[PDB]
Design an enzyme around this catalytic site. Structure first.
Site, PDB file in Angstrom:
ATOM      1  N   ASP A   6      43.829  44.972  36.658  1.00 50.89           N
ATOM      2  CA  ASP A   6      44.096  43.705  35.995  1.00 50.89           C
ATOM      3  C   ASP A   6      45.273  42.969  36.594  1.00 50.89           C
ATOM      4  O   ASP A   6      46.070  42.354  35.873  1.00 50.89           O
ATOM      5  CB  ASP A   6      44.315  43.925  34.505  1.00 50.89           C
ATOM      6  CG  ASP A   6      43.208  44.729  33.886  1.00 50.89           C
ATOM      7  OD1 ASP A   6      42.028  44.431  34.176  1.00 50.89           O
ATOM      8  OD2 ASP A   6      43.516  45.659  33.118  1.00 50.89           O
TER       9      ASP A   6
ATOM     10  N   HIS B 213      37.057  41.182  35.319  1.00 54.76           N
ATOM     11  CA  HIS B 213      37.654  40.144  36.136  1.00 54.76           C
ATOM     12  C   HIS B 213      37.497  38.766  35.526  1.00 54.76           C
ATOM     13  O   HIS B 213      36.382  38.261  35.382  1.00 54.76           O
ATOM     14  CB  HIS B 213      37.047  40.193  37.537  1.00 54.76           C
ATOM     15  CG  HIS B 213      37.276  41.499  38.240  1.00 54.76           C
ATOM     16  ND1 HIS B 213      36.747  41.786  39.480  1.00 54.76           N
ATOM     17  CD2 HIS B 213      37.981  42.597  37.871  1.00 54.76           C
ATOM     18  CE1 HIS B 213      37.113  43.001  39.844  1.00 54.76           C
ATOM     19  NE2 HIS B 213      37.861  43.515  38.885  1.00 54.76           N
TER      20      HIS B 213
HETATM   21  N1  LIG Z   1      49.783  33.025  33.485  1.00 55.73           N
HETATM   22  C1  LIG Z   1      49.093  33.604  34.479  1.00 55.73           C
HETATM   23  N2  LIG Z   1      48.031  34.334  34.196  1.00 55.73           N
HETATM   24  C2  LIG Z   1      47.446  34.832  35.307  1.00 55.73           C
HETATM   25  C3  LIG Z   1      47.819  34.672  36.623  1.00 55.73           C
HETATM   26  N3  LIG Z   1      46.942  35.344  37.467  1.00 55.73           N
HETATM   27  C4  LIG Z   1      46.072  35.891  36.658  1.00 55.73           C
HETATM   28  N4  LIG Z   1      46.332  35.630  35.336  1.00 55.73           N
HETATM   29  C5  LIG Z   1      45.600  36.121  34.177  1.00 55.73           C
HETATM   30  O1  LIG Z   1      45.936  37.481  34.022  1.00 55.73           O
HETATM   31  C6  LIG Z   1      44.792  38.212  33.527  1.00 55.73           C
HETATM   32  C7  LIG Z   1      44.534  39.416  34.396  1.00 55.73           C
HETATM   33  O2  LIG Z   1      43.448  40.170  33.880  1.00 55.73           O
HETATM   34  P1  LIG Z   1      42.186  40.514  34.785  1.00 55.73           P
HETATM   35  O3  LIG Z   1      41.291  39.333  34.742  1.00 55.73           O
HETATM   36  O4  LIG Z   1      41.668  41.836  34.338  1.00 55.73           O
HETATM   37  O5  LIG Z   1      42.534  40.764  36.357  1.00 55.73           O
HETATM   38  P2  LIG Z   1      41.622  41.700  37.331  1.00 55.73           P
HETATM   39  O6  LIG Z   1      41.104  42.838  36.467  1.00 55.73           O
HETATM   40  O7  LIG Z   1      42.569  42.183  38.411  1.00 55.73           O
HETATM   41  O8  LIG Z   1      40.507  40.807  37.851  1.00 55.73           O
HETATM   42  C8  LIG Z   1      43.636  37.226  33.453  1.00 55.73           C
HETATM   43  O9  LIG Z   1      43.397  36.847  32.101  1.00 55.73           O
HETATM   44  C9  LIG Z   1      44.082  36.066  34.336  1.00 55.73           C
HETATM   45  O10 LIG Z   1      43.554  34.829  33.901  1.00 55.73           O
HETATM   46  C10 LIG Z   1      48.971  33.889  36.917  1.00 55.73           C
HETATM   47  O11 LIG Z   1      49.473  33.628  38.017  1.00 55.73           O
HETATM   48  N5  LIG Z   1      49.554  33.387  35.757  1.00 55.73           N
HETATM   49  N1  LIG Z   2      38.937  46.935  33.626  1.00 61.84           N
HETATM   50  C1  LIG Z   2      39.956  47.789  33.672  1.00 61.84           C
HETATM   51  N2  LIG Z   2      41.215  47.297  33.743  1.00 61.84           N
HETATM   52  C2  LIG Z   2      42.237  48.158  33.784  1.00 61.84           C
HETATM   53  N3  LIG Z   2      42.220  49.490  33.761  1.00 61.84           N
HETATM   54  C3  LIG Z   2      40.957  49.944  33.695  1.00 61.84           C
HETATM   55  C4  LIG Z   2      39.802  49.182  33.651  1.00 61.84           C
HETATM   56  N4  LIG Z   2      38.678  49.996  33.593  1.00 61.84           N
HETATM   57  C5  LIG Z   2      39.170  51.211  33.597  1.00 61.84           C
HETATM   58  N5  LIG Z   2      40.544  51.252  33.650  1.00 61.84           N
HETATM   59  C6  LIG Z   2      41.396  52.434  33.639  1.00 61.84           C
HETATM   60  O1  LIG Z   2      40.717  53.461  34.325  1.00 61.84           O
HETATM   61  C7  LIG Z   2      41.003  54.735  33.696  1.00 61.84           C
HETATM   62  C8  LIG Z   2      39.726  55.530  33.521  1.00 61.84           C
HETATM   63  O2  LIG Z   2      38.785  54.798  32.694  1.00 61.84           O
HETATM   64  P1  LIG Z   2      37.252  54.527  33.194  1.00 61.84           P
HETATM   65  O3  LIG Z   2      37.380  53.560  34.357  1.00 61.84           O
HETATM   66  O4  LIG Z   2      36.492  53.915  32.023  1.00 61.84           O
HETATM   67  O5  LIG Z   2      36.687  55.881  33.587  1.00 61.84           O
HETATM   68  C9  LIG Z   2      41.789  54.432  32.422  1.00 61.84           C
HETATM   69  O6  LIG Z   2      43.169  54.782  32.551  1.00 61.84           O
HETATM   70  C10 LIG Z   2      41.574  52.938  32.209  1.00 61.84           C
HETATM   71  O7  LIG Z   2      42.658  52.287  31.576  1.00 61.84           O
HETATM   72 MG   LIG Z   3      40.341  43.522  34.320  1.00 56.74          MG
END
Ligand SMILES: Nc1nc2c(ncn2[C@@H]2O[C@H](COP(=O)(O)OP(=O)(O)O)[C@@H](O)[C@H]2O)c(=O)[nH]1
Ligand SMILES: Nc1ncnc2c1ncn2[C@@H]1O[C@H](COP(=O)(O)O)[C@@H](O)[C@H]1O
Ligand SMILES: [Mg+2]
Ligand SMILES: Nc1nc2c(ncn2[C@@H]2O[C@H](COP(=O)(O)OP(=O)(O)O)[C@@H](O)[C@H]2O)c(=O)[nH]1
Ligand SMILES: Nc1ncnc2c1ncn2[C@@H]1O[C@H](COP(=O)(O)O)[C@@H](O)[C@H]1O
Ligand SMILES: [Mg+2]
Lengths: 431, 431
Positions: A17, A45
């Site tokens: 994330d 994502h």
């Molecule tokens: N404020 C802010 N939010 C961001 C930025 N980059 C990403 N985000 C947010 O941070 C969150 C990251 O969660 P995630 O989508 O799981 O990222 P991923 O799992 O790496 O694709 C998302 O809700 C994005 O919209 C940034 O530069 N600023």
């Molecule tokens: N979408 C995700 N974002 C962040 N951490 C994740 C995500 N999916 C799985 N994990 C991490 O991966 C580890 C194993 O979970 P899993 O991927 O469901 O087998 C845990 O510590 C979760 O927090």
């Molecule tokens: Mg994510």
């Protein structure tokens, strides 16, 4: 030229994330092909462009691009119902004709309903005993990968082939899980019957991944993008084992999940959040359980993009960052969520770990050690100003620029992008 | 320079036993470090130098070199007893002080006695039912990798740490396998007690693999060699699933098993036998069940380097060769066992597959299809002469040279070496 066209990679440098969906989307606008190589819908994502906000899990984040094909490599584990569920969710949001631009590698494995079931069973079973579990997403990712390793799992091609032979294989794989959890019940015919539907539905998008990807990299030049899932410290091999996911989220996973050689890999971009977050259980050296953590948690909206479970938050941690680079070999960095720190008067960032007044030489292979280290912090002046509107390196103020260099320096990797918002435009490009 | 020193890789292009141990040994003479990245002692690498013949399984084939360190990466699965058993076997053969030149990555997983046990249980259980199994080596490789994926397995670092916590983890992993095979009995305390011995014995050779390998590739230039195990069509992802091994024997396995990025990978050499062999069950398009197969089987001594089980033999098969290259991206080839064909008056080699009078476009993802294809053969004139003494490209006779080009051409990869014997000198170098 003989080698072929090189692939651009976007990977996670921390515990997921970090904003991969955001970085991938920005680079996808151009892309001919955007693909996934590992994980399943456990991934999450988030993309934000022109007012709309998406959250993909199996669908490559480039799916949004109509002028591009989205690919799902052999390394990925797919849960059919979950796939379509996701598509529907997004269709009723503007996504149209995605099917015409999605391709499924026929060698990828299938996450069966029971896989997701035993996953949960496995977790509660770990809690009721040790009083400590992994904190899985309960999507069967673990069990599916364990089935794959055992060579008992089933693949897309097995699904399209003779259903009769499939059903038999299915029958046995299900009876096997029940042997581990004799409590786990499985409505064979139900799932099986629904699977035949999914089969005929997925059929047109399925193709030979090796060939497909090969043709694209050795034919007329193409811009191919690989969207990594999870992150470095969640890598089955290099992450904080066993508190990790069951696939290689590191760079090797690209060759493993798509079937492309190392020379066909070009830029490898490490997405790194301006602070650290972890959603599941396990060691978290810089974790801040206080008003700071709360601030990051709130200004960063770091919560379950589905379940609503707030994520653990902490300062930037250079130890995991450098260890991540040793494994991935980032060609450049993507520093996300800088804007979240606009408020802090001073920002701390972990630079090294020490066990007993003794600075440890490298990242601990044993996660249990990592849990007993005292980190050495560096305190840096905050810029205390709004950067959500910055779009050029000069828009950013002093301390902000210094914070970028700081990361850029201690990692020996140049920062190519700076994120100041969730949307595609809320990004600065340093070069 | 900034990237670092690049690694040389030796991989299998068919179904294993192509002569990797032989090629690795030749390149090791120089090498500073020789390492393994995947598999376990299921592997079997034969080396023949100055009159002595060795057969390694866990020990990198460069172990023979006293002026070099042998490495076992995190990707590998180690069976302690088996490791030492192997060392002893070789010590009583001249191997001395190997311990001082062997290094075990502290992140590699452990093959426990029961893993090997349930492996066998799993096979017979497959036979007694379907009347068809995988043909595993029964070394637990499969079960160990399935434990790893589930994150239930145990690693070298877990062994050296608090034995009390280890023993608990051990206890549960054992009880879990018993739940799958309630027939499987496990003398916990016995193994556990022997493990403490192995622990204190393995302890001095264990180190952080990521760091170790990183230091070596970014410090003063070094010649590092990666010895692959098994082969391309045995790859868990790309091989003839499920009739494959449980690790990625392809090039991605190098980044996965050692933790090094793609830019740190240089020459990737594909070892290809002048004809094809497969030891376990599964599709084998060119397999020759007749006097030809017998000839290859006998002139090639293709039998269990332990069990004595003769291996299935067949003509050269370009379909698997090209598919292997698509995934591995060989920089050059090692064509082994040419001498075995000195006798044939004419040599056939599969060039393509056709299902129903129809030539299939690419290698089948579904192994069950591969079993129903009719291959198109090309018949090539034999040279009918002894090449065991050839040492230069000009020593080889016409048809022999043409056979090399033939392979070199249909694979679009230049042949760097030609093998005409088991020993280190029984090799020709084309450039
Ligand atoms: N404020 C802010 N939010 C961001 C930025 N980059 C990403 N985000 C947010 O941070 C969150 C990251 O969660 P995630 O989508 O799981 O990222 P991923 O799992 O790496 O694709 C998302 O809700 C994005 O919209 C940034 O530069 N600023
Ligand atoms: N979408 C995700 N974002 C962040 N951490 C994740 C995500 N999916 C799985 N994990 C991490 O991966 C580890 C194993 O979970 P899993 O991927 O469901 O087998 C845990 O510590 C979760 O927090
Ligand atoms: Mg994510
Ligand atoms: N006659 C002959 N034997 C060879 C040649 N290259 C390798 N071999 C032998 O072929 C066998 C191959 O088995 P194996 O050692 O499993 O190869 P690996 O598993 O790929 O390391 C060994 O016994 C080698 O000594 C060659 O050019 N000629
Ligand atoms: N040393 C080896 N040489 C050749 N094939 C092997 C070797 N070890 C395993 N295999 C093949 O790998 C497959 C799975 O067996 P295993 O590697 O024991 O899980 C079988 O088809 C074996 O024949
Ligand atoms: Mg062998």
């Amino acid at each position: 030229a003989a080698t072929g066209s090189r692939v651009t990679v976007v990977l996670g440098a921390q515990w997921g994330d970090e904003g991969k969906g955001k970085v991938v989307d920005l680079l996808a606008t151009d892309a001919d092909i955007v693909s996934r190589c590992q994980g399943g819908n456990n991934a999450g994502h988030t993309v934000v462009v022109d007012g709309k906000e998406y959250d993909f899990h199996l669908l490559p984040s480039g799916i949004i691009n109509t002028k591009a094909v989205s690919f799902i490599g052999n390394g990925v584990v797919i849960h059919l119902p979950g796939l379509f569920e996701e598509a529907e969710k997004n269709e009723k949001k503007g996504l149209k004709d995605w099917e015409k631009r999605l391709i499924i590698s026929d060698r990828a494995h299938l996450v069966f309903d029971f896989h997701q079931a035993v996953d949960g069973l496995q977790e509660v079973q770990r809690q009721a005993q040790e009083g400590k579990n992994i904190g899985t997403t309960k999507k069967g990712i673990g069990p599916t990968y364990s089935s794959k390793a055992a060579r008992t799992g089933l693949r897309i091609c097995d699904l399209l082939s003779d259903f009769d032979e499939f059903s038999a294989r299915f029958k046995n794989l299900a009876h096997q899980h029940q042997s581990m959890f004799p409590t786990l019940e499985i409505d064979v015919e139900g799932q099986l019957k629904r699977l035949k539907g999914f089969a005929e539905r997925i059929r047109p998008m399925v193709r030979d991944g090796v060939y497909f990807m090969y043709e694209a990299l050795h034919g007329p030049p193409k811009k191919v993008l690989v969207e990594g899932a999870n992150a470095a410290l969640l890598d089955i091999d290099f992450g904080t084992y066993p508190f990790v996911t069951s696939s290689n989220c590191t760079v090797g996973g690209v060759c493993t999940g798509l079937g492309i050689p190392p020379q066909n890999i070009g830029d490898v971009y490490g997405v790194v959040k301006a602070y650290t977050t972890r959603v599941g259980i396990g060691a978290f050296p810089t974790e801040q359980i206080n008003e700071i953590g709360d601030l990051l948690q709130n200004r960063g909206h770091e919560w379950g993009v589905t379940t609503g479970r707030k994520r653990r938050c902490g300062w930037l941690d250079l130890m995991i960052l450098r260890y991540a680079h040793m494994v991935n070999g980032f060609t450049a960095l993507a520093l996300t969520k800088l804007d979240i720190l606009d408020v802090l008067s001073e920002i701390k960032v972990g630079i090294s770990y020490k066990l007993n007044g003794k600075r440890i030489p490298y990242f601990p292979a044993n996660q249990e050690i990592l849990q007993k280290v005292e980190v050495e912090y560096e305190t840096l002046p905050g810029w205390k100003a709004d950067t959500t509107g910055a779009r050029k390196w000069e828009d950013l103020p002093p301390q902000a620029q210094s914070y970028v260099r700081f990361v850029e320096n201690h990692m020996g990797v140049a920062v190519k992008w700076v994120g100041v918002g969730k949307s595609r435009e809320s990004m600065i490009q340093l070069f």
